[PDB]
């Protein structure tokens, strides 16, 4: 494989300029600017983008130690902008003090050169799509490629991971920096580590948090997920079940699940179910409660949800902001089109349409909670054009002077395999902080774990890393250990 090395030193050279990102709420107390990358690394005089970054600025001057760059998103699909203003809310204050904090969107969404097909709604769901049957499930697939391979063929080939990692690389030294510091989630944990493996002499300190197995690309990523989904579940059954007096679901495990398998067996044969009076198909019955089980705070909110597509009509005041905040708007197109692209721009999905029908059938008997909607057709299996790198090969060779990599025991979509996956293969550079009784998704700052916390903060300041691989107790787990 190739770093292609002079484009991107070709591209650093740049110097943005910085204002007041005024023009997006979100976004106010940042400053931001915009910075140009190439298309094709390998055509460095050819057709280039934009990206935007924003930036903080670290709060106390005189303790300032380098940038902090965030990944460009947690979950694939995501803006990386808006993680950034989230993180500057909730990072620990000598964190702020010390680092420049800078975020970006990748290319081709948000910010930065958004990519846009015309989909609908329903194809934006792409991802966790619950199908009628398999046949159906083909067509519906297929066609989410063909609007994509109709309106950003121009594009496709070039949305990639490694193309990613060279565009940090030219943030890099558009910022001047010899070394920066990295915080991933998710999809970002993966982009850090490709990023590390090919460029990792510039690191100073990362952190990757809920991770994405190294052996996940991509389709992977799909297939382990309905175990984790069905373990999710009928842990917030159990927690449900206890509290039989206060929620209308039964008082054991299986009693709040069939209560809950109630509300599927509807969507599942057409038959009418709402929550907030907002209506529920065969696909957000799931996928509403998916989004739930990324933190187990939100237990009760799905108690509540489920109560009301059994029984009830109102929500809870609570339970209403936060519904409102996720669904209720469809899901940001451009951050869809990136998704599907990088996707099957990393990688080439199996194309035989049979093996993923005997997949989704397995996987509905064995796991039904997700299992169809994971295991089945997916449009990344029709997609127009193929990979133009191999995947990065990541391993214990990478020079990335120290990773710290933080994981919720109990997570859901990056589970703790996973994270101990890309403990063995990035090797001896590489420590793992795993936190206890704990079903959440991005650990550090947001659930406010103190361990995790605690050892982060003395990482991402004073350099300290534990000799091997620790834990941290949870102390106010929503279940017994």
């Given at each position: 494989?190739?770093?292609?090395?002079?484009?991107?030193?070709?591209?650093?050279?740049?110097?943005p300029?910085w204002?007041?990102?005024?023009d997006?709420?979100a976004?106010?107390?940042?400053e931001?600017?915009?910075?140009?990358?190439?298309?094709d690394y390998?055509?460095?005089?050819?057709?280039?983008?934009?990206?935007g970054?924003?930036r903080?600025?670290?709060?106390?001057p005189?303790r300032?130690?380098?940038?902090?760059?965030?990944?460009?998103?947690?979950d694939?699909?995501?803006?990386?902008?808006?993680?950034?203003?989230?993180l500057?809310?909730?990072?620990?204050?000598?964190?702020?003090?010390?680092?420049d904090?800078?975020?970006?969107?990748?290319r081709?969404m948000?910010?930065?050169?958004?990519?846009v097909?015309g989909?609908?709604?329903?194809?934006?769901?792409?991802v966790f799509?619950?199908?009628?049957?398999?046949?159906h499930?083909?067509?519906?697939?297929?066609?989410?490629?063909?609007?994509?391979?109709?309106?950003a063929?121009?594009?496709?080939?070039?949305?990639?991971?490694?193309?990613?990692?060279?565009?940090?690389?030219?943030?890099?030294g558009?910022?001047?920096?010899?070394?920066?510091?990295?915080?991933?989630?998710?999809?970002?944990?993966?982009?850090?580590?490709?990023?590390?493996?090919?460029?990792g002499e510039?690191?100073?300190?990362?952190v990757l948090?809920?991770?994405c197995?190294p052996?996940?690309?991509?389709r992977?990523?799909?297939?382990?997920?309905?175990?984790?989904?069905?373990?999710?579940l009928?842990?917030?059954?159990r927690?449900?079940?206890?509290?039989d007096?206060?929620?209308?679901?039964?008082?054991?495990?299986?009693?709040?699940?069939?209560?809950y398998?109630?509300?599927?067996?509807?969507?599942?044969?057409?038959?009418?179910?709402?929550?907030?009076?907002?209506?529920?198909?065969?696909?957000?019955?799931r996928?509403?409660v998916?989004?739930?089980?990324?933190?187990?705070?939100?237990?009760?909110?799905?108690?509540?949800?489920?109560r009301?597509?059994v029984?009830?009509?109102?929500?809870?005041?609570?339970?209403?902001?936060?519904?409102?905040?996720?669904?209720?708007?469809?899901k940001?197109?451009s951050?869809?089109?990136?998704?599907l692209?990088?996707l099957a721009?990393?990688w080439?999905?199996?194309?035989?349409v049979?093996?993923?029908?005997?997949?989704?059938?397995r996987?509905?008997?064995?796991?039904?909670?997700?299992?169809?909607?994971?295991?089945?057709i997916?449009?990344?299996?029709?997609?127009?054009?193929?990979?133009?790198?191999?995947?990065?090969?990541?391993?214990?060779?990478?020079?990335?002077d120290?990773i710290?990599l933080?994981?919720?025991?109990?997570?859901m979509?990056?589970?703790?395999?996973?994270?101990?996956?890309?403990?063995?293969?990035?090797?001896?550079?590489?420590?793992?902080?795993?936190?206890?009784?704990?079903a959440?998704?991005?650990?550090f700052?947001?659930?406010?774990?103190?361990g995790?916390?605690e050892?982060v903060?003395?990482?991402l300041?004073d350099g300290?890393?534990?000799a091997?691989?620790?834990?941290?107790?949870?102390?106010?787990?929503?279940?017994?250990?």
């Amino acid at each position: 494989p190739h770093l292609l090395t002079d484009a991107v030193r070709a591209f650093q050279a740049q110097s943005p300029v910085w204002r007041p990102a005024d023009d997006e709420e979100a976004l106010r107390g940042l400053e931001a600017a915009e910075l140009t990358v190439p298309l094709d690394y390998r055509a460095p005089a050819g057709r280039t983008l934009t990206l935007g970054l924003v930036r903080h600025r670290a709060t106390a001057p005189e303790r300032r130690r380098g940038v902090l760059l965030v990944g460009p998103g947690d979950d694939l699909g995501n803006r990386g902008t808006l993680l950034g203003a989230q993180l500057v809310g909730q990072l620990p204050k000598e964190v702020l003090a010390q680092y420049d904090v800078v975020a970006f969107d990748h290319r081709f969404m948000g910010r930065s050169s958004p990519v846009v097909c015309g989909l609908e709604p329903e194809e934006r769901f792409w991802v966790f799509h619950h199908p009628r049957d398999f046949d159906h499930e083909v067509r519906f697939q297929a066609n989410v490629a063909a609007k994509v391979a109709e309106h950003a063929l121009d594009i496709l080939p070039y949305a990639s991971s490694r193309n990613i990692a060279r565009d940090i690389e030219v943030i890099r030294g558009a910022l001047g920096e010899d070394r920066i510091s990295y915080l991933g989630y998710s999809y970002g944990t993966y982009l850090g580590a490709v990023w590390t493996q090919m460029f990792g002499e510039h690191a100073d300190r990362v952190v990757l948090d809920s991770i994405c197995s190294p052996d996940w690309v991509w389709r992977g990523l799909f297939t382990d997920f309905p175990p984790n989904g069905e373990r999710a579940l009928t842990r917030w059954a159990r927690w449900a079940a206890a509290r039989d007096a206060d929620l209308g679901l039964g008082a054991t495990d299986g009693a709040v699940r069939a209560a809950y398998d109630g509300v599927l067996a509807r969507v599942d044969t057409d038959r009418e179910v709402t929550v907030a009076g907002f209506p529920l198909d065969r696909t957000l019955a799931r996928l509403i409660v998916v989004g739930m089980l990324n933190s187990d705070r939100n237990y009760p909110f799905l108690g509540d949800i489920v109560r009301s597509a059994v029984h009830g009509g109102q929500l809870e005041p609570a339970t209403m902001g936060f519904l409102g905040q996720m669904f209720g708007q469809p899901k940001e197109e451009s951050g869809t089109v990136a998704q599907l692209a990088i996707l099957a721009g990393d990688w080439a999905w199996p194309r035989n349409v049979d093996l993923y029908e005997r997949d989704m059938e397995r996987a509905s008997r064995t796991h039904p909670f997700t299992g169809a909607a994971m295991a089945g057709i997916k449009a990344p299996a029709f997609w127009p054009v193929p990979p133009s790198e191999p995947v990065t090969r990541l391993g214990p060779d990478n020079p990335a002077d120290s990773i710290l990599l933080v994981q919720a025991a109990d997570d859901m979509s990056t589970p703790l395999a996973a994270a101990r996956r890309m403990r063995e293969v990035l090797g001896d550079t590489s420590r793992l902080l795993t936190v206890a009784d704990t079903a959440h998704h991005r650990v550090f700052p947001f659930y406010g774990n103190p361990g995790a916390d605690e050892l982060v903060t003395a990482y991402l300041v004073d350099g300290e890393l534990p000799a091997a691989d620790v834990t941290r107790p949870n102390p106010a787990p929503m279940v017994p250990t």
